[PDB]
Amino acid sequence: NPIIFIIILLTIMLGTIIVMISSHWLLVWIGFEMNMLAIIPIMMKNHNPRATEASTKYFLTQSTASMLLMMAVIINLMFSGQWTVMKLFNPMASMLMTMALAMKLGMAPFHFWVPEVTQGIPLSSGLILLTWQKLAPMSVLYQIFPSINLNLILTLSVLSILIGGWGGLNQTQLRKIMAYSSIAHMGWMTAVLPYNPTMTLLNLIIYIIMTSTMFTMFMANSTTTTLSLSHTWNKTPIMTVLILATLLSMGGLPPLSGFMPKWMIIQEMTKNNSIILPTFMAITALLNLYFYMRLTYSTTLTMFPSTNNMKMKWQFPLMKKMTFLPTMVVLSTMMLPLTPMLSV
Amino acid sequence: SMVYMNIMMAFTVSLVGLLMYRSHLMSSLLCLEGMMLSLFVMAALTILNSHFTLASMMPIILLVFAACEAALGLSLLVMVSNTYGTDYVQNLNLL
Amino acid sequence: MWFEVLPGIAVMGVCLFIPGMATARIHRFSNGGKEKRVAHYPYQWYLMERDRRVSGVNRSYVSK
Amino acid sequence: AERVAAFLKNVWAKEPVLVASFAIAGLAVILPTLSPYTKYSLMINXXXXXXXXXXXXXXXXXXXXXXXXXXXXXXXXXXX
Amino acid sequence: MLYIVFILSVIFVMGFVGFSSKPSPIYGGLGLIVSGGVGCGIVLNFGGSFLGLMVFLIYLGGMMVVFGYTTAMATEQYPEIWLSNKAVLGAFVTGLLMEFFMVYYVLKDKEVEVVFEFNGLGDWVIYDTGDSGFFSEEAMGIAALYSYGTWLVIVTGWSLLIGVVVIMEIT
Amino acid sequence: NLMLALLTNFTLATLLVIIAFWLPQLFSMKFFLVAITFLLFDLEIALLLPLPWASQTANLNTMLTMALFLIILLAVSLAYEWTQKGLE
Amino acid sequence: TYKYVNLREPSMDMKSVTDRAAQTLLWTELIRGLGMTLSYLFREPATINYPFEKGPLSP
Amino acid sequence: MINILMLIIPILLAVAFLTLVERKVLGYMQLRKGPNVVGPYGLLQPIADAIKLFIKEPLRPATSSASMFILAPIMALGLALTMWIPLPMPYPLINMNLGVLFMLAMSSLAVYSILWSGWASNSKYALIGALRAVAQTISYEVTLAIILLSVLLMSGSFTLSTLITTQEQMWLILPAWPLAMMWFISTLAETNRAPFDLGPFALFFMAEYANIIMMNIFTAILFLGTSHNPHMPELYTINFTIKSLLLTMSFLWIRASYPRFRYDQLMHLLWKNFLPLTLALCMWHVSLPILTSGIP
């Protein structure tokens, strides 16, 4: 992977632009497929028996998913006629459309591939791309948020934090914990879509920055809880303070930036006379915190992972924005109260 | 209306075919071709009966991208037969 | 010599000669004037339909 | 010359068909821009009507007459 | 005699049954030739000279021919009879009976449907198109043009550059 | 009729098989890379197919830059086939 | 005795390079090879049909 | 509709009477006498081969997998005979809306005939050689589509009837000088056994030699023409057959004169060398109707 690897990475960047700037329903289908043909090579890279299994599981669960989207595109020719990504019109078309989006974002009945795909990547650079790919179908949902029946969108949000809040408890694999942290945060994504379109995109701004900081802290190789355990005493001790700060912000805690999306999600929902649904969102949010709480015990507690082998030489990773973005990820509570309006 | 009633029923059979697995892995990629074949008939008839002229190019573009997933995903199938003996959905290690 | 080769060519000047002549000479029996009309696009198709309507009944191509 | 004269006779000797792949395809881009003949071909393509011409209501109009042959509008008669 | 497209649509579903059922990639592969070739007639009858033959060139004479290689490259297992296998015959019989039961309801015009839309008869109304255009006729008569849709040409060319580069890197 | 013309050829082809059947009584994955490139090139051919039938009403100057563009990238895909294809 | 099979670079500069490239660009020598069998077709074949004609022998 | 039978029965005779031409014309190339004992000049032998193989010759299959092996000759003969329908001739039988698209489609589906034969044998020994034979046909079909389009982009739409009218004064060999050389080589890839070579087995001979005549005729439409004459069908019928027969001699010329190119170096002639050449001429043929007015 020499110069052309950047070009392969550029087509994912350009692929989302096609989805972003679009008016035609077949144009976004092209935009989704621009990502399909360009993530798989980075999913493989070194060629491993675990990588072959992950890439096939990533393909089959996602290519069939986009094929359900094309049905809803063709129902938009049978009914309502026009090829515009403004409204879905038909309730018959929306049922197949929302489920196709749930296969990438809703996750509540389509989570199954995520913990196996995220674990299957041999490299840390591939972990960023799956948290960046979720930006693409969110642009579609922001365009067609009316007309779609709320009874079978909010079920994809309520159930997702339940399975996300239980699915990380029996996991020691560091990639797997972050895989279920996606599904847990995706419930908050598919909740603001029926109740006020703004702050839904800001939820991405908080999430993507917070997740990109997380994996770039794991540039010093760690794949399990026990491998991230040997970091405070043997490796760099000051580095684990930033891992602590990012993990505390991942769960809902006020002096950190991660509580600031959770503000407006409940605020806009309570304005629409709904109290019984946002209550369930807050109790299930506690279950999300528990995974980060156990993972902060690799940074706070002793835990005895000393080992005979010791590193003396200074570490030099990639670190693209692993210094500027964690400062925004640790503290942005006072910095961003009126910034909800600035995004959209 | 009348012709659309049969090909929508043909679409559901190809949809279940993707969701069904018994030992072999090759059927899924064959069903992916069939799903795109059933979508090709549905797209063509809507533009052909209700004239568009400009939009008749859209299924031709759809024809090209149908093969892209049915080649780049098909290439991954051979890689399974390099690591393992033969392609099986029953033969998986990930948990 | 060529006197052995030429009967092999002359038999091909009969069998391959059939499809050309059989398609052409059939228009005398089927049509009135040894000609079959080509469809291409609806412009020429509509002219075929109105010719049968202009007092011909069963015939598709007929003069006057 | 270091690349013009040196990398010419070697290309004709080693892999000689690759010379034609760059020369013919290269000149296929250069010729339609510089040669003054391409402008004529565009005019006849637009002049030949695909569908029936529409008639407009006459209310103070210039260069518009009856269907009979008269000096009106453009009407292409370029090269015989 | 009365219907032209409606008979071909039944054979279209008939070939598709060997996909929900699992008759191995050899006999399952044979289904796409049967359903594809008959499937062209469904497209061709309403019009489309270019688009109707594109299925023969790409879907039939390109797509499944590459799939002919992969059956020999991975999982060949010497082709077997698709009747002796358990649950395969059960999936095939239930697959046809979902559609053939609807065929019996076509008689006396109206048929019961899961969807809200009614079927009725539609024989002369099946095409639902007048003459209209004559010279350079049909919407599919000039189906593809590089003009107007300039952006679509660039991305299709870009995506086909990806395929050649990526698949070479995997192997 | 096209349906009558096609079916007559196949029915006579089936009859020739029965004559011989009834009357008498007493590995390597390098091939795959060639097959894939066939499919990916033919789709570029599919985009370049309309050219003689399309260029009749549309503007030539808008088409000229776009028509050559597909063939250029079709050569770039072959340019990637020169940087070690294999023994094939 | 030595006879040498190697040509030792037939092409040198300009004139000698182009004709060696012309035979590889199109064909020429294949069309020249086509002409070898062409004249060979016209000349009378030496064939003996056994039930009527008989082949040469010795005392 | 009786003319269909007048385009199968004399065509099956043309494939039969090829056996004379394929070893007498090939015979004089090799200075040997071909057919002589059987007939007056061996005219009784082509029909004698049919009585030998069809009726008396029995079957011994390797495994016979239910439907296959007794389905592959139907695909072989069926696709070879259906190619005769879209042919322009003096007058075509049931003229298609687009001509050459039907011609390229039934040839691309004719790849299956050698595919199902490889699946008929249970052994691994045969299928590796069978896939190699597919590679000879599948690769050259990429270029075959390109060289077709360059001729079409010069003049005429996809319809085969319009290709005769455009050749009124001069042949298309002169404007398409390097492209005419390509059609001599590219057509030989489809089981002609000249640049590369791999009961029901006898039926494959009747299908493979049928495609040889088919490529000879199709080259005599795209590049040859001389005259049209709608008033006189007599002049066209004789003049078309002589032009096609001269190309049939050139097909048997390569089979006798030239050795096999190797399978690996078949992918060095094409792909490595031909594909950059054909596309460069395709680039040239895009500019031609724009540089000078040439639109049907």
Side-chain angles (χ1 to χ4, degrees), chain A residues 1-303 305 317 326 337 340, chain B, chain C residues 1-50 56, chain D, chain E residues 1-107 120 122 130 133 139-171, chain F residues 1-24 30-88, chain G residues 10 15-59, chain H residues 1-189 194-195 199-200 202-296:
Chain A
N1 295 282
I3 310 299
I4 47 95
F5 179 76
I6 312 151
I7 313 298
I8 293 153
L9 201 82
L10 200 140
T11 51
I12 314 151
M13 297 282 282
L14 200 141
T16 318
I17 296 161
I18 308 150
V19 191
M20 279 282 284
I21 311 155
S22 58
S23 58
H24 204 267
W25 270 109
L26 204 134
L27 196 79
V28 285
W29 157 260
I30 290 155
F32 278 120
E33 270 211 52
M34 278 285 283
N35 302 308
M36 293 289 177
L37 313 167
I39 294 158
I40 290 164
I42 316 159
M43 281 295 295
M44 295 286 284
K45 282 282 270 184
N46 298 297
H47 178 76
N48 297 290
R50 285 277 175 90
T52 49
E53 290 175 48
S55 55
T56 47
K57 212 171 279 171
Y58 180 76
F59 164 75
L60 291 159
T61 329
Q62 227 174 58
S63 59
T64 56
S66 59
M67 220 145 288
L68 286 154
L69 145 79
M70 188 36 65
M71 176 41 66
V73 167
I74 283 151
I75 307 154
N76 276 46
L77 297 158
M78 281 283 283
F79 294 86
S80 76
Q82 282 193 303
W83 246 323
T84 45
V85 200
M86 273 68 250
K87 278 186 178 182
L88 233 296
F89 298 97
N90 251 51
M92 292 283 179
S94 67
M95 290 284 100
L96 289 149
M97 182 64 201
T98 49
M99 283 273 275
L101 294 150
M103 274 263 201
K104 288 171 187 177
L105 289 166
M107 306 270 84
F110 309 107
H111 72 287
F112 302 100
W113 63 279
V114 188
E116 292 160 310
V117 162
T118 321
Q119 194 203 18
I121 322 152
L123 279 145
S124 59
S125 58
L127 294 159
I128 307 285
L129 288 157
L130 269 159
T131 52
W132 194 87
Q133 184 54 35
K134 287 181 277 282
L135 197 147
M138 278 292 284
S139 298
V140 192
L141 269 155
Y142 186 76
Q143 287 169 63
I144 45 95
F145 72 95
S147 75
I148 45 166
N149 294 303
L150 320 178
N151 293 299
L152 280 146
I153 311 155
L154 279 152
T155 46
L156 309 161
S157 69
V158 166
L159 284 156
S160 56
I161 319 159
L162 286 158
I163 58 151
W166 300 326
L169 273 148
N170 291 298
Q171 286 178 333
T172 42
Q173 295 285 335
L174 191 75
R175 296 165 191 265
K176 278 185 172 179
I177 305 151
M178 284 298 286
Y180 272 95
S181 82
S182 176
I183 308 144
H185 273 268
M186 282 312 106
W188 303 98
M189 299 282 185
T190 44
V192 205
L193 293 157
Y195 307 100
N196 179 51
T198 52
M199 280 294 297
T200 328
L201 288 160
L202 205 137
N203 257 256
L204 289 158
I205 299 159
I206 302 298
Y207 172 81
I208 295 153
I209 289 165
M210 207 164 284
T211 49
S212 63
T213 49
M214 272 292 287
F215 299 121
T216 48
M217 293 314 288
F218 306 134
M219 282 300 286
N221 289 302
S222 54
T223 46
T224 47
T225 45
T226 46
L227 198 55
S228 61
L229 207 81
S230 185
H231 216 98
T232 43
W233 321 112
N234 209 344
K235 278 189 177 181
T236 42
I238 328 150
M239 273 269 282
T240 49
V241 188
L242 283 154
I243 302 158
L244 172 80
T246 45
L247 277 159
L248 283 156
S249 64
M250 280 287 278
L253 289 156
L256 298 131
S257 68
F259 199 81
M260 300 309 287
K262 285 185 179 184
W263 258 82
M264 296 287 178
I265 304 158
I266 302 155
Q267 193 182 297
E268 295 296 306
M269 214 167 289
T270 43
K271 282 181 87 72
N272 294 47
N273 299 303
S274 60
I275 320 103
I276 201 154
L277 203 142
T279 45
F280 204 85
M281 302 287 281
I283 305 156
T284 49
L286 293 149
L287 287 155
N288 304 336
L289 188 82
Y290 203 90
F291 323 129
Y292 317 126
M293 278 297 103
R294 284 192 284 103
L295 205 56
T296 46
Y297 299 151
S298 65
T299 57
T300 49
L301 233 190
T302 48
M303 290 294 284
Chain B
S1 60
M2 191 71 185
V3 195
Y4 300 102
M5 297 286 281
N6 295 299
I7 45 173
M8 270 286 283
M9 198 71 182
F11 182 81
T12 49
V13 176
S14 61
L15 213 163
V16 171
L18 300 163
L19 308 168
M20 282 281 282
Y21 289 100
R22 279 212 173 193
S23 75
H24 278 269
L25 186 65
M26 252 296 290
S27 73
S28 60
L29 282 152
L30 288 155
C31 285
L32 282 160
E33 292 192 300
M35 275 276 287
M36 288 308 292
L37 192 85
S38 60
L39 286 163
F40 195 83
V41 181
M42 280 211 76
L45 263 69
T46 49
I47 306 157
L48 196 48
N49 296 309
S50 302
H51 301 276
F52 261 87
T53 325
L54 297 154
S56 52
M57 200 187 180
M58 308 303 105
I60 304 155
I61 304 152
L62 187 77
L63 172 141
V64 179
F65 275 92
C68 289
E69 285 182 312
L72 208 134
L74 186 75
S75 61
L76 293 160
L77 187 98
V78 185
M79 308 311 288
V80 183
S81 64
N82 283 119
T83 52
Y84 295 95
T86 38
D87 277 69
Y88 279 95
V89 199
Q90 205 175 108
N91 204 342
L92 281 156
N93 199 279
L94 282 163
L95 265 286
Chain C
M1 56 183 77
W2 307 271
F3 290 93
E4 201 184 298
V5 193
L6 283 155
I9 317 295
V11 75
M12 279 201 167
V14 176
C15 69
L16 217 146
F17 191 77
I18 290 152
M21 281 287 282
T23 46
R25 285 276 178 94
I26 205 86
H27 304 309
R28 280 180 179 179
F29 292 94
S30 62
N31 205 63
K34 203 185 177 181
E35 192 54 58
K36 195 182 176 73
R37 204 86 68 85
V38 200
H40 279 106
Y41 43 85
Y43 180 75
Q44 294 160 335
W45 176 254
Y46 185 78
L47 289 156
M48 278 285 282
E49 285 284 295
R50 69 171 294 175
Chain D
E2 59 181 302
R3 60 174 74 181
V4 185
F7 281 90
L8 199 143
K9 286 179 181 179
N10 290 301
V11 203
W12 276 107
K14 282 185 178 181
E15 294 175 306
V17 197
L18 280 169
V19 188
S21 66
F22 280 91
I24 305 158
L27 284 158
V29 192
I30 307 156
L31 285 158
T33 49
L34 285 162
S35 65
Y37 216 91
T38 52
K39 291 279 274 180
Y40 281 90
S41 59
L42 205 143
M43 281 288 283
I44 329 150
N45 195 280
Chain E
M1 201 74 77
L2 284 147
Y3 298 95
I4 310 149
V5 198
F6 191 76
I7 317 160
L8 300 162
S9 61
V10 182
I11 319 153
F12 189 82
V13 185
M14 190 72 179
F16 261 87
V17 198
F19 289 94
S20 183
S21 187
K22 208 145 187 160
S24 299
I26 302 300
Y27 282 87
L30 277 152
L32 272 158
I33 297 104
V34 183
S35 60
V38 175
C40 297
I42 306 156
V43 187
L44 281 154
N45 277 321
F46 305 105
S49 59
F50 186 80
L51 206 137
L53 287 156
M54 285 287 276
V55 195
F56 260 109
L57 293 159
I58 292 94
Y59 276 92
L60 290 160
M63 271 262 269
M64 260 300 303
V65 201
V66 171
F67 268 65
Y69 274 89
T70 54
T71 45
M73 290 287 101
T75 54
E76 50 96 54
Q77 285 185 301
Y78 43 90
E80 58 184 295
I81 316 151
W82 62 287
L83 292 154
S84 187
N85 293 60
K86 208 263 275 179
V88 176
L89 201 142
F92 185 78
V93 71
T94 48
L96 57 91
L97 276 163
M98 281 287 282
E99 207 274 299
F100 271 91
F101 202 83
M102 202 179 78
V103 178
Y104 197 82
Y105 274 88
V106 181
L107 296 158
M140 218 156 280
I142 312 150
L145 277 174
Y146 301 95
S147 60
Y148 303 97
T150 50
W151 181 251
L152 290 149
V153 188
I154 315 153
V155 194
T156 44
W158 257 103
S159 61
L160 283 152
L161 280 164
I162 296 156
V164 187
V165 170
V166 166
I167 296 159
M168 277 285 283
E169 276 212 302
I170 304 157
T171 51
Chain F
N1 291 295
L2 285 157
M3 289 289 284
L4 195 81
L6 284 155
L7 285 163
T8 40
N9 287 285
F10 280 88
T11 45
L12 285 162
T14 51
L15 207 141
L16 293 156
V17 185
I18 314 153
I19 292 157
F21 201 86
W22 191 82
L23 279 162
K30 286 174 183 176
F31 290 92
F32 178 70
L33 285 157
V34 179
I36 285 299
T37 46
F38 156 79
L39 185 138
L40 289 161
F41 291 162
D42 274 50
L43 298 162
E44 291 203 62
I45 269 93
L47 291 158
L48 288 161
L49 263 163
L51 280 160
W53 150 78
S55 61
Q56 278 184 305
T57 49
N59 296 300
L60 294 160
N61 283 343
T62 50
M63 198 188 281
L64 168 71
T65 326
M66 301 310 296
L68 303 162
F69 192 76
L70 284 159
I71 323 156
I72 295 154
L73 307 180
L74 188 47
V76 174
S77 57
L78 283 157
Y80 201 83
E81 290 286 87
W82 274 312
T83 171
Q84 201 78 287
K85 194 184 177 181
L87 294 161
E88 188 71 62
Chain G
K15 288 179 274 287
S16 56
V17 189
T18 44
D19 66 307
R20 203 185 73 91
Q23 61 186 59
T24 39
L25 202 143
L26 43 150
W27 294 111
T28 72
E29 92 288 291
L30 197 137
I31 314 154
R32 201 181 176 270
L34 201 144
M36 288 298 290
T37 40
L38 200 137
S39 293
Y40 209 85
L41 201 146
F42 300 128
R43 52 165 64 95
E44 58 272 303
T47 52
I48 288 96
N49 47 293
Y50 199 74
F52 302 96
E53 281 188 295
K54 286 278 174 78
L57 266 161
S58 59
Chain H
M1 280 285 180
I2 330 101
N3 301 290
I4 312 102
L5 288 156
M6 291 288 278
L7 250 141
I8 299 155
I9 306 157
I11 272 78
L12 283 162
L13 284 157
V15 185
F17 277 88
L18 259 163
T19 54
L20 267 149
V21 182
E22 286 186 297
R23 258 134 186 161
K24 200 196 278 290
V25 182
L26 200 94
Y28 275 84
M29 292 269 285
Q30 285 165 50
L31 213 76
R32 54 175 187 183
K33 196 176 271 180
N36 202 39
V37 166
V38 190
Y41 295 97
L43 290 155
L44 283 156
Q45 199 173 22
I47 201 150
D49 293 308
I51 320 151
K52 191 189 176 181
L53 289 149
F54 279 82
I55 304 102
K56 196 75 185 177
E57 277 280 292
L59 258 151
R60 193 175 281 268
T63 182
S64 69
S65 58
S67 65
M68 287 199 292
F69 191 76
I70 53 151
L71 200 140
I74 305 157
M75 286 290 283
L77 289 151
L79 278 154
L81 285 158
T82 44
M83 281 272 275
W84 294 87
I85 310 159
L87 282 174
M89 295 296 281
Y91 284 97
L93 254 182
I94 316 103
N95 194 66
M96 272 287 284
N97 304 297
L98 300 171
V100 294
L101 252 79
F102 200 88
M103 281 292 290
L104 192 68
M106 305 298 265
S107 62
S108 61
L109 207 77
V111 183
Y112 284 88
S113 64
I114 207 145
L115 273 155
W116 302 122
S117 61
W119 285 112
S121 300
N122 61 305
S123 59
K124 290 184 276 287
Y125 209 94
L127 57 90
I128 309 159
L131 286 158
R132 199 176 284 182
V134 180
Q136 295 166 336
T137 322
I138 206 160
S139 300
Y140 280 81
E141 279 183 359
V142 184
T143 44
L144 194 80
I146 304 157
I147 320 150
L148 262 163
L149 285 167
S150 53
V151 178
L152 296 154
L153 196 46
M154 178 75 82
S155 61
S157 60
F158 299 125
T159 47
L160 276 145
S161 60
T162 50
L163 286 157
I164 325 150
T165 51
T166 187
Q167 295 164 308
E168 204 76 60
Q169 57 274 300
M170 302 297 278
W171 296 291
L172 262 153
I173 316 149
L174 289 148
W177 185 87
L179 300 172
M181 288 285 181
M182 284 305 295
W183 274 86
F184 272 93
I185 316 151
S186 58
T187 48
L188 286 166
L203 294 167
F204 272 92
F205 282 94
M206 295 290 281
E208 282 172 57
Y209 298 147
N211 288 297
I212 289 158
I213 325 151
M214 275 307 303
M215 293 300 181
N216 284 318
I217 292 153
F218 197 51
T219 41
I221 304 148
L222 289 158
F223 298 97
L224 292 157
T226 324
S227 58
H228 184 84
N229 290 302
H231 284 266
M232 283 270 92
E234 286 177 57
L235 289 156
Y236 191 81
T237 43
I238 314 158
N239 203 29
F240 190 80
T241 49
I242 305 157
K243 289 194 282 288
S244 61
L245 274 157
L246 287 157
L247 285 153
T248 322
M249 304 301 102
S250 65
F251 251 72
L252 286 161
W253 222 287
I254 319 294
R255 200 195 175 271
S257 298
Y258 314 105
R260 293 175 196 173
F261 283 96
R262 276 182 68 247
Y263 169 68
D264 271 43
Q265 280 176 315
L266 193 84
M267 287 301 293
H268 280 288
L269 289 153
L270 200 82
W271 232 272
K272 190 94 177 288
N273 199 280
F274 279 145
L275 258 164
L277 186 75
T278 49
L279 289 173
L281 289 153
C282 189
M283 283 275 281
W284 185 263
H285 274 251
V286 168
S287 61
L288 284 160
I290 299 153
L291 282 152
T292 38
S293 59
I295 293 146

